[PDB]
Write a protein that binds this ligand. Structure first.
Ligand SMILES: CC(C)[C@H](CO)Nc1nc(Nc2cccc(Cl)c2)c2ncn(C(C)C)c2n1
Length: 260
């Protein structure tokens, strides 16, 4: 049991409000040392081994970026506690689907999306691969900030859904699905379809239409993310810049509508 200087006393932590749960332990709001808000992820001794739930610290240590949720400190010898930065509006999905959700318009959702891509472009640069990129795995905070971090066939690229080839380009596919999430404010993609239809239909060439009031320059870039041949889908670096300049270069004559 030799460990890094990320290591803290497990009395400095102060598990306060229970955020949620799940199969792989639970997650809490709280306090580390005196002040500092913190998320506190834990492992249930029951599910997976010490080496398993201390892989996402092998990585979460090396990876520092503005839009990846930052590891603050761990406690390795079980019971386990991963302490990270607090994101205080919950997943992208909740946020976008709850009280504030209805007030967001396109400038705001496009900006969120530019941030997600900024993070998936740092992911990109490091030759990493996320493998489950969707709104539910994005977290939101003060100032509409959005950080990446942490069976979904509907968000997953064909080549991964069937042949298990996850690549950063198969991540781009989900990005485009995630663009439907931002643009309809929370809705499951492919509405009123079970998974076999989604696999069936994307295979015969179907693609989600343009959502209500969604400018057609947005949809094009969803279709760019949904190209059959994965080497063609654009990089997170292209995606990011496009979304950064959206309202000057692409739609500089955009007027706010009923919803977007
Ligand atoms: C327990 C889960 C349901 C939630 C969201 O998926 N997990 C969660 N919520 C977080 N925040 C949060 C804030 C308000 C309400 C709720 Cl439910 C969650 C959070 N902040 C930082 N992290 C991790 C990167 C450690 C977080 N993780």
């Amino acid at each position: 049991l030799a460990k890094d200087a990320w290591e803290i006393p497990r009395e400095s932590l102060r598990l306060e409000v229970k955020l949620g749960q799940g199969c792989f332990g639970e997650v809490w709001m709280g306090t580390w040392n005196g002040t500092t808000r913190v998320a506190i992820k834990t492992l249930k001794p029951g599910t997976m081994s010490p080496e398993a739930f201390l892989q996402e610290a092998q990585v979460m240590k090396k990876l520092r970026h503005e839009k990846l949720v930052q590891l603050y400190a761990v406690v390795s010898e079980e019971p386990i506690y991963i302490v990270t930065e607090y994101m205080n509006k919950g997943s992208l999905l909740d946020f976008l689907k709850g009280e504030t959700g209805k007030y967001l318009r396109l400038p705001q959702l496009v900006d969120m999306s530019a941030q997600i891509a900024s993070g998936m472009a740092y992911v990109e640069r490091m030759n990493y691969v996320h493998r489950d990129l969707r709104a539910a795995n994005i977290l939101v905070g003060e100032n509409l900030v959005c950080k990446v971090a942490d069976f979904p066939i509907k968000w997953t690229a064909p080549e991964a859904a069937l042949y298990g080839r996850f690549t950063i380009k198969s991540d781009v596919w989900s990005f485009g699905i995630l663009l439907t999430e931002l643009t309809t404010k929370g809705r499951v993609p492919y509405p009123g379809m079970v998974n076999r239809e989604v696999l069936d239909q994307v295979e015969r060439g179907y693609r989600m239409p343009c959502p209500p009031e969604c400018p057609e320059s947005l949809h094009d870039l969803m279709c760019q993310c949904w190209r059959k041949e994965p080497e063609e889908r654009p990089t997170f670096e292209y995606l990011q810049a496009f979304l950064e300049d959206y309202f000057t270069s692409t739609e500089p004559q955009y007027q706010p509508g009923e919803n977007l």
